[PDB]
Design a protein around this ligand. Structure first.
Ligand code: ATP
Ligand code: ATP
Ligand code: ATP
Ligand code: GDP
Ligand code: GDP
Ligand code: GDP
Lengths: 449, 349, 447, 54
């Protein structure tokens, strides 16, 4: 239906004209509708987080200590987005959170949590309560690669009254266990696991030593979250923030060991010599890492940080210091320049509802960073409390429930907006915005009521 | 809506002689029609036996009594024989000082019926929007899905004169196909496509065969358009192609309606402005010493008084503008002879 | 079920204790519930407006120029209450409003509106639009007792375009009219009118002169409003206000001629020598009239005004500003004293919702005066206009006063039900007896 | 009347540090430099819509 979708009259204002005057925020303009010939369910909202990382869900959790720790990053990755572990912590804590995110989902579980036979049931209960993993292997000397002796699962100890009893008393013993021998393809191993009606399947060598472990929980996670953001080994994607000082170099190494896929530089004003040097050094030392430089709001700054080797840019500054820029103008300008050079951009700030996220993605941002919008969801750090007959979170904000339901709500909203605009993807919306086929109207101050 | 006003009343409501008075009272209370004909077997085309009117049963205490006991019997009734011109029949009705005049064939079977109430309605409402048969015009809304096709047929049988497509964003392939199919299947129907706010959308829906367009989208979704700009642009394009437009949304007072009509809209759609009038659906209730309507809004009284108020307001505005019609205002606006001033934010105080 | 209804524990506070300390408004107290063995439909809310006038609906329209004119008084009387035509007008205008109310509903219409044959149709249209009456008789010289020549009804002139034509051209003429001969009992005459399927039936003597007129509209009004407050001749009850000056004597006479059944004295402080003298003079000169004295708030004022010969008392003063009394206390005290002497009382002021009216009636008032609660209804004087999309008259349009009166009726019925008594006379008696109990509410307890 | 803001010295030092941080974010090591580069077109601005001031 190109005859019906293609605007020839072009009744409206193009992005270039819209952002040619004063700096605008998202309420200053609206997107005009186009032509619809598809259902909103078929809309692809995906966007590039970096040169090489595509997100099925163009949403990133902000690296604030009140928003993104291991749990939030896991939820984001599972829904098709990603989270940035905050850097207001020691290197060890940040690496531990990153590990939590990365080893939650696996194909073959390497270094499976295992214990020795004399360990008390209390320890297995602690493992399940703190870290949330079951199916603990019992091995020679508790080494994760020792001879396999048994397995301890939920129903093996949920009835025991003496928490000091050894697991060997209640573990399922190796002679009675379904196991596999290395080598094995993950596909065959997981089909075996399915047919076995069990929750876990160890893979051992010829000496009965533990090579690895398959978990039915991973199969069910894959089934319930088919759009999870994953790396090439089946792990959830994870990002981590860091400053660009000299000490932070150490941090980077640690995070690289923990398995981050994206490094995110934390700066209110990222066009500095220290950040340029840091990006150069990171790309030189850890070529496998992708770096999101920033923060920036002008095409100068973007040029410097892209020349340094940035794979993505965080846009936002101000969304008493007299320096910054209205967020929608900043996004349009920086994202246009960066796209000309093949770099995607993240909108960071002033994103308070779904219309703003849709607008920010349409005018150039590939993905959107959420802070205030998701603060107070169940997956953020902090303790819940009751006050004035209201549920709040503290180290205050109102309880918004599960972040998963919120992410699905934003997904459906973006889809419906794209439908009304008349394009079946947001990459298409960005292309047609640059082409002048998706049009806007600036709204007078009165027209915003 | 369609059978409220008639010239000749076709299929006149009639009953059989054994019907209780309670039934005639129910007819008057629910549907609001009097002068019920009593015929052979209650068929609306059966042999005429009598008539039941207000004063024939307002005094009766046994509501189970048959109407034949109190009806005015046919031998005593003023009637007419087919054929008859409506003019002569209604003059006869006037001279007869009666409220109703049946028209029968040679077998005394009911052909049709004239009601003095229609004469008085015509006298008290001389500007009624009417079709060619003397019935009130009526429009009906429908979505553009495949099921709604059925709906359309039904409405066409009921006698709608305008079909109105219901959509927040009407520039869709489904609506284009629907308009094509409606104009093909029911050529007598006129279709108001929409909703639209850009001249793209208007082009597609007019190419499909729309006879009118509903303008408005937004008067959290990021898509829409300020309403006055939308009206001006879409109405100008549509007028270039000979199609009028309806302003739908953001119309909250009389000045806004006048402005919307001056900048291109031919007619204006009222929702919030008339919600809570006596004629809207819903039940009235008292609360906090205020009369409200519920399935809340404040009682605005009769919609008729409100419509007359808006009429007088539009007239006074057109006068101040210096043109004796709103078609003239639209023409002179396109011509540059009716002029405007943009108001600074301060100037709106 | 007297064993179940009779309070022996008496967990609660009696009216005497409640009003024994500081002056209270209606929000300071609540009525405790009792025992229910009946439907709210069966509740009798009637109250005495005066010693001899019982109102099926214990509601009186206030004599304010913004509330009660002929239309409001008609609505009130029709729903079982009554209205007090204000005195902010000339004597002639007030008498005309009273006459409108009194002659709206009739049995035999004794002075039927009549015209001469040469009158234009425009005049009959004016009569119907202004005064609202049809079936105009056409007689010799237009006298209401002249020889009957014809009758003009709606369908006789609804089609004519020349409004200057004489009625003789379109009237239904006497030779074709169903009529009756004097004398005739109203019952037979109205049944004949029903059987005749006509709207009117003149009653003539042997000389074909108009004796009177029967209207089907009166039968239908009786059917649709079976509880209308009526006098002995089938007319609606009507009250009128007046000050107690010497000039107002004239006013009173005029109102007496117009047919008022109750005179209401207008004063913020009615315990004056002028009001005492006025009441004495009214009871002496027009004994058929009943007088509602007031306004009063203490039992001393009430003693003086009852000794003068008042048939009822208006309660209220304050509901510069240094004189008055909280309204609930005033009502309880004055109504108790007056009831001891066989005089009912009218609550005037501070009645803003149904709970307040119920409380005021429970603590002693027989009937309640409505002002603000009915201001802005369709039946009030004044013109409607639109502003900010709201319709106002200023106050907001409340629609028909009839629907509002029915709402208040149902509210009082449901309240009496929850209290456990099937009438408000019973509620007042049991309040004085200590079987209907109350609770004072702390300021926080009010929400 | 006015509210106590304490020592003017602490306030002057606060303003000093604020101006320094602002100049840093702007990318110039002196305010004479900022003025020169403003006249030269190398220090740039953005006008803010009324909405953008929230
Ligand atoms: N590969 C295996 N071979 C033999 N037994 C196994 C194997 N894996 C798990 N089991 C045993 O299955 C039994 C029931 O599993 P259990 O319910 O306790 O944990 P799960 O399989 O992870 O599911 P869930 O915790 O949701 O109940 C346990 O005794 C467990 O030791
Ligand atoms: N064509 C007719 N011939 C003879 N009698 C008729 C005819 N039409 C109506 N009538 C009778 O006229 C008498 C009075 O009419 P009626 O008032 O009851 O109803 P109406 O004419 O519709 O006016 P309204 O309901 O407003 O009073 C009735 O007995 C009715 O049956
Ligand atoms: N006593 C009568 N004898 C003969 N014809 C009469 C008599 N009274 C009225 N009519 C005529 O019958 C019709 C009267 O109808 P009706 O009395 O019901 O009118 P209305 O009181 O003005 O209100 P509506 O007609 O709308 O119900 C008129 O044509 C009138 O000329
Ligand atoms: N037994 C078991 N181990 C798992 C599972 N999922 C992940 N693991 C592994 O369990 C380990 C978690 O404990 P670990 O990291 O060694 O302790 P830490 O050094 O204090 O963080 C990791 O090596 C995970 O890879 C599971 O489902 N069952
Ligand atoms: N007797 C009478 N019939 C009328 C009048 N006005 C309209 N009608 C007809 O009365 C019918 C209304 O009843 P009807 O539609 O048959 O019942 P339904 O199928 O349940 O809607 C319609 O056929 C109208 O045309 C009137 O004034 N008097
Ligand atoms: N013909 C007729 N007269 C009525 C009717 N109802 C009341 N009337 C009388 O019509 C008269 C109207 O008042 P009138 O004295 O003529 O006018 P005024 O001098 O301005 O007060 C009254 O005397 C009523 O009694 C009715 O239904 N039909």
């Amino acid at each position: 239906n190109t005859n019906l979708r293609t605007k020839t009259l072009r009744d409206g204002t193009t992005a270039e004209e819209l952002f040619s005057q004063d700096g605008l925020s998202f309420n200053d303009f609206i997107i005009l509708p186009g032509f619809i010939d598809f259902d909103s369910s078929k809309v692809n909202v995906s966007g590039q987080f970096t040169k090489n990382i595509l997100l099925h869900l163009p949403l990133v959790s902000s690296p604030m200590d009140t928003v993104t720790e291991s749990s939030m990053a896991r939820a984001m990755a599972l829904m098709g987005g990603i989270g940035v572990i905050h850097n207001n912590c020691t290197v060890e804590q940040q690496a531990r959170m990153v590990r939590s995110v990365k080893l939650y989902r696996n194909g073959f579980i390497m270094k499976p949590k295992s214990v020795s036979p004399d360990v008390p049931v209390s320890t297995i209960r602690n493992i399940k309560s703190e870290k949330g993993i079951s199916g603990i292997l019992v091995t020679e000397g508790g080494k994760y690669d020792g001879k396999l002796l048994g397995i301890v699962c939920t129903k093996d100890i949920d009835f025991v009254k003496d928490a000091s009893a050894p697991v060997s008393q209640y573990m399922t013993r190796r002679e009675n266990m379904t196991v596999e021998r290395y080598p094995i393809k993950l596909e065959e191993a997981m089909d075996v696991l399915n047919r076995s009606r069990h929750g876990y399947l160890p893979v051992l060598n010829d000496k009965d030593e533990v090579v690895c472990l398959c978990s039915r929980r991973d199969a069910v996670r894959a089934r319930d979250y088919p759009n999870s953001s994953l790396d090439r080994n089946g792990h959830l994607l994870c990002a981590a923030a860091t400053s660009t000082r000299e000490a932070d170099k150490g941090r980077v190494a640690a995070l690289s060991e923990a398995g981050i896929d994206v490094l995110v530089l934390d700066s209110s004003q990222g066009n500095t010599i220290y950040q340029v040097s840091f990006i150069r050094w990171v790309k030189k030392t850890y070529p496998h890492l992708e770096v999101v430089a920033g923060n920036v709001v002008t095409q100068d700054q973007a040029k410097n940080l892209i020349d340094a080797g940035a794979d993505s840019l965080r846009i936002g500054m101000g969304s008493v210091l007299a320096c910054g820029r209205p967020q929608a103008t900043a996004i349009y300008k920086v994202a246009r320049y960066a796209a000309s050079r093949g770099v995607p951009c993240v909108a960071d700030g002033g994103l308070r509802n779904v219309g703003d996220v849709c607008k920010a993605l349409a005018v150039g941002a590939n993905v959107a960073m959420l802070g205030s919008m998701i603060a107070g969801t169940s997956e953020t750090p902090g303790e819940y409390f009751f006050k004035d007959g209201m549920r709040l979170k503290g180290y205050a904000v109102l309880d918004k429930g599960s972040v998963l339901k919120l992410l699905a709500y934003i997904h459906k909203g973006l889809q419906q907006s794209a439908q009304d605009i008349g394009e079946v993807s947001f990459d298409a919306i960005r292309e047609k915005v640059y082409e002048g086929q998706v049009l806007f109207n600036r709204r007078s101050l009165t027209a915003q009521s």
